[PDB]
Design a binder for this molecule. Structure first.
Ligand code: MG
Ligand code: MG
Ligand code: MG
Ligand code: MG
Ligand code: MG
Ligand code: MG
Ligand code: MG
Ligand code: MG
Lengths: 167, 201, 258
RNA sequence: GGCUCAGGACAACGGUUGCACCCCCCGCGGCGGUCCUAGCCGGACACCGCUGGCAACCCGGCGCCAAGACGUGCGCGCAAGGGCGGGCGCCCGGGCGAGCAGCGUGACGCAGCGACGGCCCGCCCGGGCUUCCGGGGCAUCACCCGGUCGGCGCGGUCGCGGCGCGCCGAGGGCCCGACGCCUGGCGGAGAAUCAGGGUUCGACUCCGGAGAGCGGGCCUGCGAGACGGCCCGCACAUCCAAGGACGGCAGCAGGCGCGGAACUUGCCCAAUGCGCGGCGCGCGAGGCAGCGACGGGGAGCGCGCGAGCGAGGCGGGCCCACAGCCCCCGCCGCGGAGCCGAGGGCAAGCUGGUGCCAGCAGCCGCGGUAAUUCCAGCUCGGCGAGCGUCGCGCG
């Protein structure tokens, strides 16, 4: 099946090597999870029997995760509304596919329920008084079956705002 | 061969009998009927009228059994997993492909397996005895030359009570020993540093 | 490539120091995993059949062991292929024979008869200090033994004294210049001597310079240097004091014995 | 474990590093605190009884019953993952050569163990990859590569990585021989040959790699892309009461074909080891015997003026899993040499035939009437239970 063995590649000089054995089970891969944001249908997580009896769980559909505000040391569970930027490709954003590094929009209710009454970063307050906050995904969906992350702040937040402003 | 050895079984009396059929037109009421479906005995007017039967299985003319969700009148092939019907596995995870007749009933069948569910007040030539006895403690408690009786199971005798008590005592002792060793170690190291998992709760 | 581990062992591929006859057969005993590794151990059956001669075949060893007629570190063992290593305790109460397994000068296993005063403890080498679950310190030894909560003063490469009945450290000898050692690896297995110098090369091995009691000097790497006391061995050792004679003297001794 | 060497030429393989990019059954030693009927829980199936299908292979339906099986599960907070938590030119404990392990704390989630208590950790064997050096021939193959070379990001993997995908840039290798083609190409430890330097070979004993008709795919399991495991296509093959079913000896013997060329369809686990398990079972691994002028080693066809002694047979021992066989003991006692050559190289000569015919001859040569070389007899020489002929390698 799918494999990542190097026997099927070329040499540094661009030459064909030649195959000297059949395919082996250490060098195998699997079809990507393609985790979809929900926006019969519900949180669906499957399990995979890996090498040595280990268990690897990949998520197919999900909608909630744990997020943090490092500067204010605030951490709660929120709902992810949609994905809005991804460096790798725009197709993933249109299809709302969850992967590490995707910039998402979360709801503000769990945070505004306790914020807007303490001196903090101005921009985070502006997001809080709205209906969504810019955040990022830090976990690896498809390997641990979870979608955690942290709230943006600083130069990177400016970078992403400048990137998605014209749209 | 143009016949069908119909098999009749009675769960309540555990009495089974078989007969023979030489015709089909009398059985057009049997065609199109699936398993787990009521089949009135009006076709069998020789003391089985007014009695309801349910189809349980059968075998085609070539011997192939009849599967469930096939929904066909012809036998087909499919990959049978371990533990599935009409398949005996030799290995732990071996599979095998074989032919099975479709569930839908048709003229091709040479055997039929049917049960009796609801019968008329009239009796039939077709009581349930028991060859063995319950063995678990709960079963017999619910239900009340060499003498042979089954050995009992799940019954508590003193040695089991002593064993459980001893196991609890040993576990408590082990935990206490580890606790006191850790406390003595922590009392020591008065002139250095430590990093251990605090017990929460 | 074999699809799994190896369960056999050709006689011609066996270690040299086991001293197995070439014509004995195609196969040789395969030691099982335990206190010591394949190349740093010897099976029980070899000791009990090819040396002490208390058995003539595999079957006799099987019966003797399954009857529980041998003790290892105070524990009866019933596996003919159980591995016996270095600084171990061998006891057969039926004939009141107590042995500690050490190395001879020529580089082969030997049995040193001992007394009852010192058969309640063994010496082991510490070569790994690490943090376990919850962060609790541990340590390991050359015989696959783990002890929880050691003294901070104990460091790596040291030597530890532990009672057979209870795995509780009694005393530890440090690794330092001016201490008697026993070599246990390579060309100089079995030689006894005192340390003189220590030279370290970053990222690689560390070499130790020792001088024998008669003035001979030799070297080896730190992975096969064992401490046996402070200036004097703590345990009883073979008749000779770890002196490797030359070929001339060995030939003379053979001629005398013939 | 055993068989074979088809495939494959910066690969495999040999020596030397690393995982601070990894996984790991049995065994050994430790550790063992589990969020929200516990004098012991619930239902099934097997075999089995009745009833039946079909040529065969195969199974059906009903029925009570067992678990160190399956399911739930009493219980002192605990799996995986994620956020925050060090420095002010460098250096001068848990551990390191090396800021690596562990821990705290803010949030997620209730994984594993538990109806006779083990999840977990260390070691061990093993495996995966990886640094450096070595690693066939042809230049009537001189230019080659285009995921090919690097960067960024995600996915997947036990895991690093163009391993895969998206974007960006352009790159990498070459007379110190790339690329291409060929190989009656498995490699090494080693073998043959013989002053010294070297040449040729390396199926096969030990280590490693690859395969089970060709090409692919997959379940179980710690571990297999396994074939005395399953599925498909292709080429062959078999049984059929013609509808269906079934197969892979490069495992041990045996058979066909091929070639110049290669053995019994034997007995046993007693030995050496392997799996299971307490006073043992099984093993065409392995051992014993049968055939055997591949071959290697040790004796013998006489000495002496008469005695002695072999091989051979008859019986007893010893040995053997049983039998042989060697060897010991008593009785009777089969003595046998062939293959080459006699001009030179090269040690070794007498008549009769034939007549450039028949033939000999590795080379020179003989034979057209004494043939010292052909055909026969006598004689003689070499080696010797061995001798000669053919092809290959070394010299
Ligand atoms: Mg709980
Ligand atoms: Mg259970
Ligand atoms: Mg080949
Ligand atoms: Mg081999
Ligand atoms: Mg294979
Ligand atoms: Mg296969
Ligand atoms: Mg086969
Ligand atoms: Mg096999």
């Amino acid at each position: 099946g799918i494999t990542h063995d190097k026997m099927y590649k070329r040499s540094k000089t661009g030459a064909v090597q030649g195959k000297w054995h059949k395919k082996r089970k250490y060098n195998l891969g699997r079809q990507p999870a393609n985790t979809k944001l929900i926006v019969n249908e519900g949180q669906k997580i499957s399990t995979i029997r890996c090498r040595g009896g280990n268990i690897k769980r990949r998520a197919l559909r999900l909608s909630h995760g744990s997020f943090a505000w490092g500067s204010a040391d605030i951490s709660h569970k929120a709902r992810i509304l949609q994905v809005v930027y991804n460096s790798t490709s725009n197709e993933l954003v249109r299809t709302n596919t969850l992967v590490k590094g995707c910039v998402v929009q979360i709801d503000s209710a769990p945070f505004k329920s306790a914020l807007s009454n303490d001196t903090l970063d101005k921009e985070i307050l502006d997001q809080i008084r709205g209906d969504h906050i810019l955040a990022r995904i830090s976990s690896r969906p498809g390997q641990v079956g979870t979608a955690d992350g942290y709230i943006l702040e600083g130069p990177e937040l400016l970078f992403y705002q400048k990137k998605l402003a014209p749209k | 061969g143009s016949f069908c050895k119909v098999n009749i079984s009675n769960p309540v009396t555990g009495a089974n009998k078989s007969l023979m059929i030489e015709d089909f037109r009398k059985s057009q009421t049997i065609h199109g009927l699936r398993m787990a479906s009521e089949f009135d005995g009006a076709a069998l007017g020789e003391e089985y009228a007014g009695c309801t039967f349910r189809i349980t299985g059968g075998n085609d003319a070539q011997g192939f059994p009849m599967y469930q969700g096939v929904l066909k009148s012809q036998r087909a092939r499919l990959l049978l997993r371990q533990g599935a019907k009409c398949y005996l596995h030799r290995r732990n995870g071996e599979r095998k492909r074989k032919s099975i007749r479709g569930c839908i009933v048709g003229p091709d069948l040479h055997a039929l397996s049917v049960v009796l569910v609801d019968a008329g007040d009239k009796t039939l030539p077709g009581v349930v005895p028991k060859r063995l006895v319950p063995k678990r403690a709960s079963k017999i408690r619910r239900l009340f030359k060499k003498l042979k009786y089954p050995k009992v199971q799940r019954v508590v005798t003193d040695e089991k009570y002593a064993r459980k008590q001893r196991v609890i005592a040993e576990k408590k002792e082990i935990m206490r020993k580890s606790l006191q060793q850790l406390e003595e170690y922590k009392a020591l190291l008065s002139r250095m540093g430590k990093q251990h998992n605090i017990r929460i709760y | 490539m074999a699809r799994g581990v190896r369960k056999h062992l050709k006689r011609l591929n066996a270690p040299k120091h086991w001293l197995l006859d070439k014509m004995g057969g195609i196969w040789a005993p395969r030691p099982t995993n335990g206190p010591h590794g394949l190349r740093e151990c010897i099976p029980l059956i070899l000791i009990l059949r090819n040396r002490l001669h208390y058995a003539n075949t595999y079957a006799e060893t099987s019966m003797i062991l399954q009857d529980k007629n041998v003790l290892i570190d105070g524990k009866p063992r019933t596996d003919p292929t159980f591995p016996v290593g270095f600084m171990d305790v061998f006891e057969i109460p039926k004939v009141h024979k107590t042995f500690r397994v050490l190395y001879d000068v020529k580089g082969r296993f030997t049995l040193v008869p001992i007394q009852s005063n010192e058969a309640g403890f063994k010496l082991c080498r510490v070569q790994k200090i690490f943090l376990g679950d919850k962060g609790m310190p541990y340590l390991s030894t050359h015989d696959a033994r783990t002890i929880r909560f050691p003294h901070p003063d104990i460091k790596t490469n040291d030597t530890i004294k532990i009672n057979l009945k209870t795995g509780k450290i009694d005393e530890w000898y440090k690794f330092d210049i001016g201490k008697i050692v026993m070599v246990t690896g390579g060309r100089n297995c079995g030689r006894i001597g005192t340390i003189q110098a220590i030279d370290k090369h970053m990222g690689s091995y560390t070499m130790i310079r020792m001088k024998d009691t008669e003035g001979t000097e030799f070297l080896t790497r730190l992975c096969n240097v064992f401490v046996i006391g402070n200036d004097s061995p703590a345990v009883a050792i073979p008749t000779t004091k770890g002196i490797r004679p030359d070929i001339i003297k060995n030939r003379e001794l053979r001629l005398r014995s013939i």
